[PDB]
Amino acid sequence: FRAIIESPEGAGHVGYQYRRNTGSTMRMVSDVLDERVSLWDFHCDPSGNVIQPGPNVDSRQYLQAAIDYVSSNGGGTITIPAGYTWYLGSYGVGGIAGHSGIIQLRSNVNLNIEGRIHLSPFFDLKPFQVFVGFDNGDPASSGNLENCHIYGHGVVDFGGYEFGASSQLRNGVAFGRSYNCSVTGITFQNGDVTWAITLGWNGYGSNCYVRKCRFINLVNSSVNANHSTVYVNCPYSGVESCYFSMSSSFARNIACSVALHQHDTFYRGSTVNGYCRGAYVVMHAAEAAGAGSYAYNMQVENNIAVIYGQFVILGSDVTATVSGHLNDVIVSGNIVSIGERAAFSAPFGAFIDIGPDNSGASNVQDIQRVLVTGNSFYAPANITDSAAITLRANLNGCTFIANNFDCRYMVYNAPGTTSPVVQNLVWDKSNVIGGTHANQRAGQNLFDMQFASVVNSTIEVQLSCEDLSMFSCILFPASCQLSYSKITVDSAWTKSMSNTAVFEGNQQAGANVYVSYPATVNLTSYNTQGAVPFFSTDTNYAWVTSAYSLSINENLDFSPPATYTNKANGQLVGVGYNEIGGVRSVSVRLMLQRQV
Amino acid sequence: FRAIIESPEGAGHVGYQYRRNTGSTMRMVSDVLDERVSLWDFHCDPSGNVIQPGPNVDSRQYLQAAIDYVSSNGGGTITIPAGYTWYLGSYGVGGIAGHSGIIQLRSNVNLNIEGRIHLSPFFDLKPFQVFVGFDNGDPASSGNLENCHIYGHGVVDFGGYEFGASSQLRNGVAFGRSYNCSVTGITFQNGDVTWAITLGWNGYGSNCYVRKCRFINLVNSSVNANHSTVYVNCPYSGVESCYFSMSSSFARNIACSVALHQHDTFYRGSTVNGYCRGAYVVMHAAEAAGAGSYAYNMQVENNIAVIYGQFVILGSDVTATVSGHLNDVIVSGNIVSIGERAAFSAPFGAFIDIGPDNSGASNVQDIQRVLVTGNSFYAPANITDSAAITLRANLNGCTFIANNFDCRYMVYNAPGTTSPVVQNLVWDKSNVIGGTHANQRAGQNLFDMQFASVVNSTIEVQLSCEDLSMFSCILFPASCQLSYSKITVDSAWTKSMSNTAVFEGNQQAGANVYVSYPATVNLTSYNTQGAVPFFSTDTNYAWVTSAYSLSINENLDFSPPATYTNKANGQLVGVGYNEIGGVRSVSVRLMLQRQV
Amino acid sequence: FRAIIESPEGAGHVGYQYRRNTGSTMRMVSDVLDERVSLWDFHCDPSGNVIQPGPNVDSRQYLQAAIDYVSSNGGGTITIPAGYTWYLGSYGVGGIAGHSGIIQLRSNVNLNIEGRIHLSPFFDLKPFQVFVGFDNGDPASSGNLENCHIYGHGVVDFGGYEFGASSQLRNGVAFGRSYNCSVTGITFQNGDVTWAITLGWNGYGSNCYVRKCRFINLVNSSVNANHSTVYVNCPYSGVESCYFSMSSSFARNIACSVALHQHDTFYRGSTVNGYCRGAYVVMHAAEAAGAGSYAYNMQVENNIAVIYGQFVILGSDVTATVSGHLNDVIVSGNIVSIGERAAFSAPFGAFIDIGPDNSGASNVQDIQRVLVTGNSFYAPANITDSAAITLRANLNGCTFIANNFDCRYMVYNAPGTTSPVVQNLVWDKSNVIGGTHANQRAGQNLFDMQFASVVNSTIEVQLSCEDLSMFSCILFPASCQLSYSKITVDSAWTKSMSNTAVFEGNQQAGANVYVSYPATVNLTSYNTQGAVPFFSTDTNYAWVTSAYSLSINENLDFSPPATYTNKANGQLVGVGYNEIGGVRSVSVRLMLQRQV
């Protein structure tokens, strides 16, 4: 009996009944201890003696044994104990080897990480993916991972090691073909990695989430090719209430916080500092196998960001046999700013970017039905390369309502570069244009419409302070066709502007172009006393349907017309009044109108 | 001693002190084991031998015994262990029998559901409510449930069974008269039920929440009368970050995700697919006992939905002695679409519905102070039955600002049906009207104002692309009174429209009606050389306060007036200019204005 | 052996191996029990006998011993057991004595509070801070607190005791110089305290959060000087999904729910009832040591509130050597109302308040780049003291877009009081002005511009119903300079108003002032048959650039001009038409325009 009690079966001979309740099960101590499980239950030598974790101990085989066994019982939760640092020091074997995997995750087996998990220097200058849910080196032949949750107050520490080569990949958690999986509460820190977490595989997966996690200093070298902290590659999945911070210069050029790459995905309530980019919202044709060729129901809401490049990047692209499409997107409630930096020292600053594909093509995209509403954007006055939207690829629709944009440009694309075909671009009058860049805009157009064509578009410009440095409020080059569109410039703060709207190809004359903007016009009257016509000197107003005075009349003896219409020769004409006769000659500020 | 150790009191004789700390309590093993409790502690036969759960074992009495005992100690948390499926196979007894209850919940007794709970076929074709917090068959005589939380990674599975009769009710969790209760993390799946979760009873309760839950395939038959996944029937309560999915055809006609039925309630950050409806926002007079007759502070925000009927349904109604009122509502940040379906194949598609009461009455409602802002809505081009608002019952106010609506109608009600009395309907110019249904609108009015009367309303129509198929942008039948209102149609994309605004009863002439819209007008001048009047042929403009040209003047020898006013006979008149004399006759596009 | 087994080392001699797995560690029962720890492990007398908690037992020394020991092992989580009330009855010692501290928190030592913690009457009429993370009486010489989380379903109860003197301070949790600390799930209730929770110290700290907590009845006496439930005094920190309720009259005058006092902080998704105020958003120069002199990236979103004073209060101030600045703020998606109360019975009601510093100074502030969008506000019709913004101190910018404000005033400041210098105030036309206070506004200006000066501002007034009781829609006193601004009053619902816009100093004549508003004007014509001038009687229109008719013409024999311009003497002039000659005399409603 003494022998049995001191044996490993001893707890199995000591009886227990809950709180001495005579209606409760007559159990043994071992039964109650078996209700939980920790790493300590597997972290032992071949004789069963516990092994203490530390920098000179590789915990990997023990944690895999724990996961393997619990999986064999239908699942449960393994605790990684608090107050210890558990090091990993070798690669895993089998199906995760193809993924440079360390630990293989299994279905229904959760990890409650309370302590620290820390990579040993075996991993310096090597690729690695710490937790992998694929069960095959080829993801197309992998089984699924289901019902796998990682959570707790603990930490995954990537050891600070730099990438050995740019072509290497590194990851924290790759759930794989993942269904009902999640990461909650965990701090990922101190590395040079490609991603911290990836959800799904090429549309396969569902109901995967990252919640209340922290991501700190996960890019550190010039070798790192590219970084996105969370890649969402399955539908009905998202990121909420997370914290992302980088301190490295390289992060300001390469790093993005989130990628939303399948339908019904979201990014909410998070804070970002030190990153190049906020979120990619993309349908890659090459990723369309699991959930279709459309990314729709995409939501970026209520985030706080300090970035160096672009906040939201929209895109879609094609392969030889698949075409990707992006539609039904909402971007709302975000507060974003470009951090302090020299002009042109990072990727062009933007709130929205319509980005060309990975080969630079601008003619592959199918992006439409996007709503950008209720956001703030700010860039410091020196940052020339800052825009509400950089529209660099073909666009089939994007709607802006009730935003506050305070940056160098409202709409921009570089001349000479891409020539996007633009449809259904809507810039409502409720967008407020800030004044930070007033006086900085010599030679520049606030809306610089450097496109192949614009159709079914609305641009309602409203200033809220003067900026007499800008060349124009909106400019269309002669190469940009314009049709079935509405372009207006409100008069407030424009009285002293040389140019307000500029149509280099006289595109405002098109049959279905609706415009209005201020202009200075010289007029001369006939000499008749009484009601008397006034006519413009210049003859470039054949497109004008009506015009009206924006100027006071300093004269007593006459008044020019309050309103005007045109004539076939392109003059403006209206009826004023000569109290006394005489030829009159005046220069008036007019609101020019066409079909509005 | 050997006997005592092997007895159920054995753990009570084995000493323990935490980590060998000499300052810690000298306890016994049983004391430490007593700090937790699981189903295994009650899942035993009359001799105390543990019983293994399975399809042929009814776990119900054991789980009730666990809850009853823990309740007797002031509460705690019972674990339902992972790696096992616990079946329920009989009805509960006592106060929950009136509710077809299975398990009775008790105050301060939480359930950590890590495994699976699964209904046995005893329940096929029968009513049931799995967890019930009432303690009496009559809810009015029930005590309260307080401080009861259900949480974990586990599952409640309803066994797939169909309803036996439409009059039956089925539920997952009915908290009852519930205060500080919640469901977090749980998957509810595989059933034909009326609700998954209900919070509160007729306004009694507070601080009840459903967070991070999943609801999958909970309608499956033509017998199911009606389904709402979560019914919120107490104040200061809500639903956040949940996932709702249905696959059944019947769900597209009957199922709603949430009901917000008391004040200070919310529905946020959730994803919905396959449902008829998103949320009811309602004050039923019949439910007003616990928290008053007003539903106020109602919040529907930041959700993602694919539905087949209506996204938000507003209503209030009366009983013989109580009148319900709905006010102070916000609907914001939602991205919603009607899924692919034939026209008229499901309940009329809508973003907002003002719905008649359960007996079809449209004259009982008191709905006001509602803000609908910053939302997107889309319906495919074939879905005739799609509207930004179906306004089908009396409305005392609703405000639309900065939404993007892309569907067949903006405002609709069916003619010949209800004749709502409308007050304080505000449709701000910042609402963007999409183009998906361009060319589909033969015979139809984009704003079809099929009401008894409209007062204190604003409709500012702005198109963003052409749709020459529509009969009009806005139409008032002669039966609809219109007063103290503002109705405008912006000219952009309207030059080729036959009709823009239509007032079948000439209602735009009312003393306090403020309007503007485009119209084509034929004019003829006098023959005088010089300043010369032009007059409309037609005499239906006695209501016009001013008009101005929307057309160019192709003539050299004359120009028509830029602006016009009227005369008592209903002609328009203005002063143009004949360079050379002659009677002139022109057809001009004008902006007609009344008091604006 | 019997002796060893019954000794406190007995569990250390009973062997265990997990689930009889021969690959698992050969452990002892004590090893597995040592994986968790509770208060019971320290709640014992000097002989090691457990002590039962209760009203006559002071648990403080035992809980401190638990925290101290766990800290010595690198941390972990202590459970405060369910089903017991643990009383605290004495002050702590050492570094927390300076803070009237009870329990000292330590790094990596979490508290899972499942039971109740309750203050004994030793604390009646005394100061106290229940949990303190400082380790020194002087916060400047304190070390940090890191990785400390308090969570669970339990309760902190402040015993109901009133403050003994107004100068006393009371707190629930002061994390101190706190990094990665949080409170989740806890109910704080039944007290008279200054704060429930404070995060950070004068900018020192990071990543501190309060989530899913309840705060109930935490002010109860006239002695309580001031209350803010959560004070956020470190960056990258915030409050989400919490519930705040007060019932005391004194709370309606003194209590605020949240203070956001450092950069990158947030307040989201919460419900508030019974409070004076919703949130302070402030940069105090005196708090700028840890994170700089700027509060930026401040977010108040998606909250529900019933308050008695002001929802959001903006401010910044200076010390002898530091100047505080507030910028980049977003207030969005909130639904707020002033509760039922007499006019002037609580602090002036407001959605936004621009508040003077604690000494009443209005000339110290630097507040700019604020966006207020997509909110609802309501105040009952009797509450004279209700405003969308009380602008009481110097303002460098604030933007309003697409809100719904339903209260007495839109913009207000009291005359004779402060004279703020105002820049970059933007009130977009998409703001909807409700009608609740129609007929209540005798003697009052809806926008009462009681400022020293206004520059670079926009006010676009749009009514949605009539209120002929108001003196004016917008009024500038002669003492208020106005320049480089845009002020418009839409005509809808204004035909019967005596005054629309009022410029007591004729400020609308300034060179860069852009205005438009309705006015009644008397005109007289010359007697000439045919085209004939009409001139205003009055000569106060030298500022007018154009005007147009808002009235119909009831005459057959003539028509007045549709449009007008001015003359140097300040008359208006335009060209009408006399079919028959005669001097005409008419009174017309005109839209007066200046540079628009």
Ligand SMILES: CC(=O)N[C@@H]1[C@@H](O[C@H]2O[C@H](CO)[C@H](O[C@H]3O[C@H](CO[C@@H]4O[C@@H](C)[C@H](O)[C@@H](O)[C@H]4O)[C@@H](O)[C@H](O)[C@H]3O)[C@H](O[C@@H]3O[C@H](CO)[C@@H](O)[C@H](O)[C@H]3NC(C)=O)[C@H]2O)[C@H](O)[C@@H](CO[C@H]2O[C@H](CO)[C@@H](O)[C@H](O)[C@H]2O)O[C@@H]1O
């Ligand atoms: C870091 C990042 O995510 N960057 C975005 C771009 O992603 C693209 O480049 C990445 C570079 O790291 C990835 O490619 C790399 O990894 C591939 C996947 O690894 C293989 O498969 C894994 C399952 C195994 O575990 C690995 O062992 C390995 O076998 C690899 O095939 C590539 O060769 C390599 O360079 C990224 O790849 C995706 O990764 C996710 C996450 O792991 C995975 O779920 C997907 O299966 C995988 N996709 C593909 C197609 O392989 C790859 O997509 C991203 O393209 C870009 C988007 O913006 C651009 O394109 C837009 C749309 O046209 C346009 O609007 C915009 O302007 C463009 O800039 O954004 C980041 O740069």
Ligand SMILES: CC(=O)N[C@@H]1[C@@H](O[C@H]2O[C@H](CO)[C@H](O[C@H]3O[C@H](CO[C@@H]4O[C@@H](C)[C@H](O)[C@@H](O)[C@H]4O)[C@@H](O)[C@H](O)[C@H]3O)[C@H](O[C@@H]3O[C@H](CO)[C@@H](O)[C@H](O)[C@H]3NC(C)=O)[C@H]2O)[C@H](O)[C@@H](CO[C@H]2O[C@H](CO)[C@@H](O)[C@H](O)[C@H]2O)O[C@@H]1O
């Ligand atoms: C499924 C659903 O919720 N549908 C909404 C309508 O709800 C109404 O019908 C339901 C049909 O299932 C419920 O009625 C049924 O259940 C009743 C309650 O069961 C009793 O009481 C429970 C406490 C016991 O546990 C049970 O054992 C039983 O005794 C029953 O009395 C009815 O006879 C039965 O048909 C639903 O009832 C409510 O249920 C909640 C949740 O359990 C409960 O808290 C309430 O006490 C109970 N209320 C009442 C009054 O009994 C009942 O409300 C809903 O009416 C509709 C709203 O839209 C319509 O009305 C709007 C306002 O006028 C109008 O704008 C809109 O256009 C209309 O369509 O929405 C769903 O259909």
Ligand SMILES: CC(=O)N[C@@H]1[C@@H](O[C@H]2O[C@H](CO)[C@H](O[C@H]3O[C@H](CO[C@@H]4O[C@@H](C)[C@H](O)[C@@H](O)[C@H]4O)[C@@H](O)[C@H](O)[C@H]3O)[C@H](O[C@@H]3O[C@H](CO)[C@@H](O)[C@H](O)[C@H]3NC(C)=O)[C@H]2O)[C@H](O)[C@@H](CO[C@H]2O[C@H](CO)[C@@H](O)[C@H](O)[C@H]2O)O[C@@H]1O
């Ligand atoms: C209750 C509250 O928070 N009210 C807001 C005002 O806060 C200011 O008054 C408070 C009154 O309770 C605090 O001052 C009191 O407490 C001080 C701190 O206690 C000391 O330090 C602690 C660390 C120790 O633990 C204590 O033992 C003690 O030694 C004390 O020095 C003061 O003497 C005392 O009256 C509040 O103080 C802050 O408290 C936080 C939280 O604990 C702490 O982190 C900070 O270090 C501490 N700050 C300072 C400067 O001491 C003090 O700030 C608040 O000022 C007001 C803001 O609105 C006004 O000002 C705006 C900007 O100009 C203006 O826009 C607006 O119109 C104004 O009304 O809001 C609440 O009233």
Ligand code: NA
């Ligand atoms: Na690979």
Ligand code: NA
């Ligand atoms: Na859109």
Ligand code: NA
């Ligand atoms: Na072109």
Ligand code: NA
């Ligand atoms: Na019943």
Ligand code: NA
């Ligand atoms: Na409203």
Ligand code: NA
């Ligand atoms: Na009628």
Ligand code: NA
């Ligand atoms: Na102190």
Ligand code: NA
């Ligand atoms: Na702003």
Ligand code: NA
């Ligand atoms: Na002044």
